[PDB]
């Protein structure tokens, strides 16, 4: 079973959007789709819930007026829109569902909503070398960028975001002596919003 | 609404001992509670339903336990690999309602941060800027001081800091410390200096470069 949401969306103030959450690996009209949003110290809310055999929904009324459920049988996907869009509405979306069978859950990745009016700004990528290596990712905006050694998991260490000057920086570290060089250590590193990939080799 | 509070937001353990977190509904909602686990960068998954059965492979080391308003989130031989924030909810009536989360802290032998600088790469220099990265990787505890120095002389102008959440396998912190200057002004000078300050140590942890 899974859940495939977007990774990102960059939508002006007063604009709306529309959030896929397409599902696969079970049968979709079998389990209620559920929606929650997160924002920093905000916790967890609930959204609402739909059934897909036949799009009977639940609201939580603090989202009645901006949140609209639906969803497309034939293509097993869900959707949620969101209406008069402000900055109170950037947060992560998530898509969930309950599955019986035993009793499992399954979430999308959620998809991480900017409301603003600056534009998309692809990330710079810079090599750091000096065995602890790294990475600097500067100046792009918004939220997220997904950095990825390789692939390498171990002493890796992404430090999240600052805002400088309304752009975003974060550096990665990757820590791996006879390594390198040798070994082609690459940074892998994606800006969903601006549709921009970059590979960067860190060289001596 | 029915609010439910979880009136820790942060609880500190050993890896091996057991942590309860507590969560208390506004209303009566029998045990329609549920618990939930989210790891960082990850999506939240579900631990327990009904406040006592278990989802799919979570361990019985999570022991749901209470009816009515009170609701407890046990934790047996908690691992450095359960860092997390937890968060009860209640589905028993609308709107389904969250706690607002409980963060667990790992405690540790106290441990010395892993010092590199970076000079600024050769690229960025070809678009006017200039930014040295210090990183300070896996120590413990949280608190740790950076000090930048420029051919001797301090620097607090135009520092970038950030910190990593609590790492799961080894419950140490990491935290990177970038320097950005001009080309020009980078030029001007010669020794950058990344200075840590620990409790580990009594003098600074020094890591320097000539241009
Ligand atoms: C966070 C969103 C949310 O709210 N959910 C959720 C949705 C998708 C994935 C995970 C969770 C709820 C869905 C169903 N409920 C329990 C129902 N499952 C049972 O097995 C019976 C329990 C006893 C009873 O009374 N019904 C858990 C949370």
């Known amino acids: 079973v899974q859940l495939q949401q977007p990774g990102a969306e960059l939508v002006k103030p007063g604009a709306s959007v529309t959030v896929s959450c397409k599902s696969s690996?079970?049968?979709?009209?079998?389990?209620?789709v559920h929606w929650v949003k997160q924002r920093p110290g905000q916790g967890l809310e609930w959204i609402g819930r739909?059934?897909?055999?036949?799009?009977?929904?639940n609201y939580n009324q603090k989202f009645k007026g901006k949140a609209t459920l639906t969803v497309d049988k034939s293509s097993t996907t869900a959707y949620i829109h969101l209406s008069s869009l402000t900055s109170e509405d950037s947060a992560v979306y998530y898509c969930?569902?309950?599955?019986?069978?035993?009793?499992?859950?399954?979430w999308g990745q959620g998809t991480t909503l900017t409301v603003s009016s600056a534009k998309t700004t692809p990330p710079s990528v810079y090599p750091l070398a000096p065995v602890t290596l790294g990475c600097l990712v500067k100046g792009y905006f918004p939220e997220p960028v997904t950095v990825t050694w390789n692939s390498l998991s171990s002493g890796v260490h992404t430090f999240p975001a600052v805002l400088q000057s309304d752009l975003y920086t974060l550096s990665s570290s990757v820590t791996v002596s006879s390594t390198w060089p040798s070994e082609t250590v690459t940074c892998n590193v994606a800006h969903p919003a601006s549709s921009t990939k970059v590979d960067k080799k860190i060289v001596p | 609404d029915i609010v439910m509070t979880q009136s820790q937001k942060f609880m500190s353990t050993s890896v091996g001992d057991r942590v309860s977190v507590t969560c208390k509904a506004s209303?009566?909602?029998?045990?329609?509670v549920a618990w939930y686990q989210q790891k960082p960068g990850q999506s939240p998954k579900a631990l327990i339903y009904?406040?006592?059965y278990r989802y799919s492979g979570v361990p019985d080391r999570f022991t749901g336990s209470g009816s009515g308003t009170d609701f407890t989130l046990t934790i047996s031989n908690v691992q450095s690999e359960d860092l997390a924030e937890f968060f009860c909810?209640?589905?028993?009536?609308?709107?389904?309602?969250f706690g607002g989360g409980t963060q667990l802290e790992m405690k540790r032998a106290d441990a010395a941060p892993t010092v590199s600088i970076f000079p600024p790469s050769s690229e960025q220099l070809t678009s006017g800027g200039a930014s040295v990265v210090c990183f300070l990787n896996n120590f413990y505890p949280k608190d740790i001081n950076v000090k930048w120095k420029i051919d001797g002389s301090e620097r607090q102008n135009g520092v970038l800091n950030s910190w990593t959440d609590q790492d799961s396998k080894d419950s140490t912190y990491s935290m990177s410390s970038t320097l950005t200057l001009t080309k020009d002004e980078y030029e001007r000078h010669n020794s950058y200096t990344c200075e840590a300050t620990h409790k580990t140590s009594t003098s600074p942890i020094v890591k320097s470069f000539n241009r």
């Open positions: 969930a569902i309950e599955a019986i069978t035993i009793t499992t859950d399954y």
């Open positions: 690996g079970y049968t979709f009209t079998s389990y209620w």
């Open positions: 739909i059934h897909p055999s036949d799009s009977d929904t």
């Open positions: 209303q009566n909602v029998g045990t329609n």
């Open positions: 009904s406040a006592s």
């Open positions: 909810q209640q589905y028993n009536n609308f709107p389904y309602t």
